[PDB]
């Protein structure tokens, strides 16, 4: 997964979000994104085994709702549907 997070950083650099990466505050906002993969399936395809795990930090966590382990996984299922499409 180190090559995976390196590819993620390279994609962030290549995309239009390179402006947010150049801006220092938005750079920290992007670094707040967790490049964490939850393995799904046994020997499945690289697309299906892919999963995005995002972790908030205060004082943004007290306002924004994310895929918490004890929540409804609304963002998780929305991202899964959009990822299938």
């Amino acid at each position: 997964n180190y090559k995976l997070t390196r590819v993620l950083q390279e994609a962030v650099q290549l995309s239009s979000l390179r402006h947010l990466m150049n801006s220092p505050r938005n750079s920290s906002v992007i670094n707040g994104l967790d490049a964490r993969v939850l393995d799904l399936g046994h020997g499945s395809v690289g697309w299906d085994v892919f999963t995005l795990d995002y972790i908030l930090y205060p004082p943004l966590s007290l306002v924004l709702n994310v895929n918490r382990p004890f929540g409804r996984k609304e963002y998780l299922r929305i991202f899964n549907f959009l990822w299938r499409f």
Partner: peptide
């Protein structure tokens, strides 16, 4: 989380071992 966690943990272990080997500046007196 485990990646950066183990990275920082290895760094902290090395730092603590080096600080303990270097004369142990932490002390308590009476």
């Amino acid at each position: 989380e485990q990646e950066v966690r183990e990275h920082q943990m290895k760094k902290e272990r090395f730092d603590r071992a080096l600080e303990s080997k270097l004369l142990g500046k932490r002390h308590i007196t009476y």
